[PDB]
Design a protein around this ligand. Structure first.
Ligand SMILES: *[C@@H]1O[C@H](CO)[C@@H](O[C@@H]2O[C@H](CO)[C@@H](O)[C@H](O)[C@H]2NC(C)=O)[C@H](O)[C@H]1NC(C)=O
Ligand SMILES: *[C@@H]1O[C@H](CO)[C@@H](O)[C@H](O)[C@H]1NC(C)=O
Ligand SMILES: *[C@@H]1O[C@H](CO)[C@@H](O)[C@H](O)[C@H]1NC(C)=O
Ligand SMILES: *[C@@H]1O[C@H](CO)[C@@H](O)[C@H](O)[C@H]1NC(C)=O
Lengths: 22, 169, 164, 168, 22, 28, 170, 25
């Protein structure tokens, strides 16, 4: 959920399970 | 699989895994995360600039190739690569006006209210004349390689937190 | 509200919060393995077609997250022939009006007919596709799945083969 | 001449002038201004609702042609705002992807300080969208009552002018 | 420039002359 | 009940699997 | 009021007026036009070579700083800098296949139909087999400072008229 | 109306008309 910023790359990790409703 | 659709110079383009991997993107699967990584030389990056600090913005989306559950995942990237610039007492983060509205500031897992008094108490001064200009007090930090800044923007309908280390370089 | 329901109706899109969608006739259930989206036939934004006493309900739905960085949008269109099949004698009939969807697959009882060594006729199904899709299924539990390609989305429509 | 791009359901569709005029858009040229007009029935509108109050969003771009100009001309409109009772006129703005940065009432900028808002007779609730509770006395009670809400929406400044005449 | 919202329509007017360079 | 529309006399139901797939590093 | 977007090698660089002026571009304000000039040493030029003739291509787009209306103006620059190369009675323009498709030919403010007969009526022989090569009859030119050639290109969907004086480049 | 690239051996120049074209003349 956050963009990781280093001097060489931009990295984002996205959960593989979708959130429920209730 | 997933394909990468890239919004670039106003146009939308779909990129296969092979093209993206040749052109500076990386795709990795974790038991808990899908990880997308972009090199600053990657295709479709837009490079804003405020003073000598660069902000790289990629408007990216992961589109499933399996159309039955057609899934689209916006994965925008906003990074101030050269931030911060430091001087004797202040570390300065310079964000040009790039389409993102600064909505939250986080220093070492502490969310700071955008009240002028709260920011000043936390040693932060914010200038909005030409981009967002953050001057961060070094004293309030907790050493070197131990401080992280998350600037949250609202970028074209997506809430994008930008995590940067507040190291002087 | 984790997710918003996007309904395409009358050439426009209405974005509905979870509570508003429930108010307007949709239901939402969550399993460890599946997200469940249900729409009652009175739900808002449904498109209804008629051919011969058999109605096709089409919903152009998309769940759109209110989340932050991962703004995920999932197309969840629904297509249902509510009244199919009509049985008289020696023929159960399923009637699908032309609605912009492309019939790409017929599946009867876990038997994909496009991937089968037998033909549609050998499965006892007669297809007329001049004025919509008319399936004539000989009468002499069972379920039928009709797969559609609709605006780039693959929509399997499962119905029971009981006589209404 | 021009073409009308419409972002609708995740895809962008380009319409010609005649097709757009057929599908609910209008175009006019005077010496000073180019004019775009849309009904609330036009093609491609994304509608947002907050307790029976509809917020219409048109993501339009005029595209020309050696000079190939593209102009973003988005429209945001709270068609049913303000619903009124005896004491207050209430403007309800659903969350729709636009960031509220500017509030103006009858040509008076307010600078978005909750303290000065409360002092100006406005209550702003951000829990379920933007809920403006305006004092009907603070309004002139004429056709000259105005509300401008300024949003940052997809890298654009979009000032929405609505009359503070009670809903009908 | 500004979106005008009425009972029936949404209207925006854009200047025909392009601005200069600072 | 896997990305398929389940049609009933009163309602229409779709089940969307929660687990997202990979890209070329699990099953290329 | 405006910024200059330089689109090079898969990325875009958003340059203010000052920084663009430092990296090789210029901007002037006129009541009638908005003018952008670039030197052949500007930052972000794509340079292509066909025989002895060089083709510079800048993928430039003016993006407004002001946000109330947001305007982006495609202003791509394409120039055959060393064109034309006369020998005695023939002026030759050579364009490498750089991804821009030849769409129009205008000589001395006269649009020409893209046909063999029409071209040679106006003194032009066009070869598209190995890049675009035009062999124009100097006898059919005025032989002045005002001889001009305009070639319209479709460049990734953009219309790009290229005005080069038809005076030998030496 | 139109915008042409003016090409000299030393510079590249494009002039853009400031007034936008109308919808119907
Ligand atoms: C480091 O830089 C910061 C920001 O430029 C300086 O802090 C400001 O300095 C000015 C004077 O130049 C004061 O008027 C402000 O009150 C200071 N605080 C701000 C702007 O938040 C700081 O003095 C610099 N330190 C040096 C040069 O040693
Ligand atoms: C039942 O309908 C089928 C469909 O055309 C028809 O062929 C058959 O003759 C009908 N039989 C009776 C008894 O109605
Ligand atoms: C009118 O609406 C405002 C909005 O919050 C409320 O505070 C007030 O009590 C209402 N007055 C009535 C219902 O008489
Ligand atoms: C001059 O150039 C033309 C083509 O550019 C060529 O056909 C002609 O033969 C040349 N003149 C000579 C070789 O004397």
């Amino acid at each position: 959920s956050v963009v990781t910023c280093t001097k060489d790359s931009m990295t984002v990790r996205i959960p593989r399970t979708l959130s429920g409703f209730d | 699989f997933w394909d990468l659709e890239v919004k670039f110079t106003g146009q939308t383009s779909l990129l296969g895994m092979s093209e993206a991997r040749q052109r500076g993107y990386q795709f990795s699967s974790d038991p808990y995360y899908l990880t997308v990584q972009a090199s600053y030389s990657a295709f479709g990056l837009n490079v804003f600039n405020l003073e000598n600090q660069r902000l790289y913005v990629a408007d990216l989306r992961l589109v499933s190739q399996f159309g039955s559950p057609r899934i689209s995942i916006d994965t925008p990237m906003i990074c101030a690569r050269d931030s911060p610039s430091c001087n004797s007492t202040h570390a300065t983060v310079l964000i040009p006006f790039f389409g993102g509205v600064l909505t939250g500031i986080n220093v070492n897992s502490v969310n700071i209210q955008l009240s002028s008094y709260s920011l000043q108490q936390h040693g932060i001064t914010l200038d909005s004349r030409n981009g967002y200009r953050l001057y961060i007090k070094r004293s309030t930090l907790k050493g070197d390689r131990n401080d992280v800044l998350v600037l949250t923007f609202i970028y074209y309908g997506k809430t994008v937190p930008m995590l940067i280390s507040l190291v002087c370089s």
